[model samples]
Target: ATNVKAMKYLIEHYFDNFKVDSIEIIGSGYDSVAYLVNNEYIFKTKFSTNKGYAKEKAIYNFLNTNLETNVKIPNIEYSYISDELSILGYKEIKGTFLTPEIYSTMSEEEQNLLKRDIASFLRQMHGLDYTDISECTIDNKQNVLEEYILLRETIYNDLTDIEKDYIESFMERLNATTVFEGKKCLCHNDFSCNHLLLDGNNRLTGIIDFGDSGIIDEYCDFIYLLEDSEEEIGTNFGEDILRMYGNIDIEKAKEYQDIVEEYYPIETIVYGIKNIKQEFIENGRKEIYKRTYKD
Candidate 1:
């Protein structure tokens, strides 16, 4: 359910004399819920417990000021930050989300151009002098290790043998992987297809949801693009973009993607434990078994 209280608070505190003819919940994630206001603006709100909006707003401002690309990002028009609640409002980046289905329907030329646009956008972001936002650096390796420790302490004893084995194997690979020991840059750490917005002509228009944006391994941005899933444009699409983007080790990017994919089940388990979501816990365990028995 959408937070009616938040809608009321936003109207009372921020909208003022501006009239809202329509409002609806557009998206909700682990951290926040987004509401579309009057079909023109998006208002993302979260409590103090999820303190990413402040940094996200800063990232948006930093990118808007620094990046020279035509690709649009959220430019926060309204914000309220305090110890109790926070909200960021921006004009909606109106476009259709690029999905595998949409990509399949595009002409080869259109596909090529979209890939190039994506490459250019990533190149610009990765090449930025991000010293201003350097404080947002994220160390993926250490974070995973901490999560593994949490799993060991909380649920290792309760896990099935195959589930335990899958986790242990992932930890081993995590420890051995060198993908994290590379150039760092400001990345849209959640740069998945759904975050990508395409105009009616199939050109890249904007991107959204920088809640997970941070200075991380350069390969972090490529993880989703390199995925071989129904949700993504596939490994070939990512390879082509990497070639166009140029000057990076493609093998290392794939290596990074592999490790991230391998950790999904464990990550799910951790989320379930922290959020007290039994369905997620069971789903993670089921995934571990499925992966273990895959032929």
Candidate 2:
């Protein structure tokens, strides 16, 4: 897996049609290793099981066929399988990760235009029938809150004093509130600037990474749109998108965000510990310390 030439040979052997000229490693996330092949196609291999990628491919294909979002969604053109390894191939879509530095430079009019566009994209996506993705769950308030408690229990021993206090206080606040009621819809569970691909002109060209996609409380997706930075509120560039999403239960939005923030570090560290992933352990520890040590 480490040798570039050997990897290329494997891909070529599996997919005989391509006259591949170059392979550039584009991404290596928790679940998969991705590369741009010949700068025309994206080829990915999973670090875990093929099941996740296979599920993602199905969801991608479904969204590509149904949604009218003004962007190209991933559609795996070729899926090569084996007991030990599997490969997914798709034509590379144009665009780059939307960075904060780049976002800060856009004109107000351009910013609002994208805001409307992205909001509408979320609106359309969130409005879709949940049954479209067969594996999606009906994320009720009780279940969502239970997930927070279970995750906290999993990593309780590792929490620093600051983290423990933060979670304890956040839990009390969350327990006092009533859950928001609405029909659950599809959520791009990891919707953030990184997953949103934008062109140089500030137009959204594509959306990627649906491996974490699911049907969840609609308010859950708004957290990332509202949270541009860790401690601040006004700094979030895409708050307008949430405004456009409108009719959201304001209290639930805040509560859901707090729960996710509380759960993520511990959840990540626990998953890393169980799976023996050093990357997740290091990143999780870094975030935990960041939250614990910061004012």
Candidate 3:
């Protein structure tokens, strides 16, 4: 179903002004496909199985009206023709994904300034009016631990014995952590280095891809802050941002981060089994193995 010809045709079918001659694929991922039409617009389409763009768009519009930040949040329009081929389109925001390469080029002051701006942006988002989205609340804090427990059960047999031992130890570590407590607010749940956009000046220009976003613990956004540990800019960025955000339970943030690091590979395998190719599933298993074995 990843036929470029079919994808191109679908792009043409929807955008009449699409410069059919200049249509180019921007990128594609497990749940979404994207194309750059001519040079001005990027078209994104969620796979049939992927849901939530409608909610993302709604949240974007809501935030546009209520909150102001130093970044361009995605302003998207949806075309829901059928389950398999629904599309989301928007003007391509100009910026590059924040990378160590980019960070290395920045002055220490510039780097810190960007970090402060990012913290401010997150604070603004987490501080949004939760009254209207009141229904979007976490019912039980234990549900967080419960989901991890559930995932461990599903992927237990899939893991090698060594992997299982490492995983079991991590799970026990998670179990000993105190119960989670935090204000539920609108969280840009996928806030990571890839999603953080920067201009040539290292100023943030845009934050895109909000499908994973919803009302969640304010600290949930901090996990992705730790995701870029391999990169210089993000290696200590989570701790720094949490420091700036103030009054944070740093230990609790670490707890969720531990869960994410351990839980994501298993979750990815579960997803691959249902929706992705065998090769991709195999890659995920290898990733789990690498994460667990540390060898």
Candidate 4:
């Protein structure tokens, strides 16, 4: 359903003798749209204005060359870059997305092994000599500060008193928090359960979406893992992994997660303003008040 014609043509044009029997949108984000071709390959497309696909493709190549793990990542087989469009196609990593529900059903031993696998993957990636991909460096604190400036210029005045206070308090913490000053390494900045893929035995088989991968503070990879939310495996899961992946400051990872969580509303508001989405702005503003009074 909804097989886009342009994407099909692009795939056919880029790859040699590739006949697309079926093509459908598998995922769409602000930066790019992903299409699954013939139920086997994922072709991620973006406008020329967005350079993420190029970087993502490079990261995948770098990882495939450097990382010696059983876990699989995208290996680009077809690529097309032009002034108008860019596309990256790779054989899709196969497995079920590891969800919290599925995680809860696992035995204690199974859970421990899964956690170890996750830790091992992170350790290997973090230990990589990222000088080659140094162009992919990210300074998250600066990024947030820029977003805050955007919020101040556009919507800060319109915010309620409580909302303003929450933003101010978060800014204060952002200025003081030392989590951003930690060891830097190549990290899957958006590491989350949804990106985790598991085989029939519930072992992690592949990790997908290196779109946000970068050399940044090591704690960046741990933020989602440390989240205490319905979507996440839970704080204990992260704690156990941190223990297994020793030589890092566990408290600092927790602090980084907390700060990232705190700034989410403001980030959403900034996103709304930039994207001209009024509903998202309202939702973010309302979330501020809810967080402020959440006893």
Q: Name the top lDDT candidate.
A: 4
Task: Give the higher-TM-score candidate: 3 or 4.
Answer: 4
The 10-residue segment with the lowest total lDDT in model 2:
230-239
- C-alpha lDDT of all candidate models, in order: 0.89, 0.71, 0.72, 0.90
Q: What is candidate 1's TM-score against the reference?
A: 0.94
Cα lDDT, model 4, residue 23: 88
Scored against the true structure, residue 14 in model 3 reaches a CA lDDT of 77
Better of 2 and 4 by TM-score: 4
Candidate 1 lowest-lDDT run of ten:
1-10
Summarize candidate 3's per-residue lDDT along 1-295 as a digit string, tens digits: 3555776777777767554556677788777778876677777776678336556666767777778776898776535445666777777899889987877888988888888888889888888886765555543345535645665666557667765675567567656755345667888887778888888788888888876777887778888776656653564778887888888788888777777677666556556655645665567678877875576
lDDT of residue 127 for candidate 1:
97
Q: How many residue pairs clash in each candidate?
A: 0, 0, 0, 0
The C-alpha stretches of model 4 lying farther than 4 A from their native spots are 1-3, 48-50, 82-84
Tens-digit lDDT track for model 1 on 1-295?
Answer: 3466558556656656756667888899776778898889898887656257778999999999999988999999888887667888899999999999999999999999999999999999999999998788899999998988888889889887888889888888887778889999999999999999999999999999998999999999999999999889999999999999999999999999998888998899988988778989999999988888899
Stretches of candidate 3 off by over 4 Å are 1-5, 15-21, 134-160, 163-167
Distance (Å) between predicted and true CA of 244, model 2? Answer: 1.5
- The residue-level lDDT of candidate 4 at 92 comes to 95
Clashing pairs in 3: none
TM-score of each: 0.94, 0.82, 0.83, 0.94
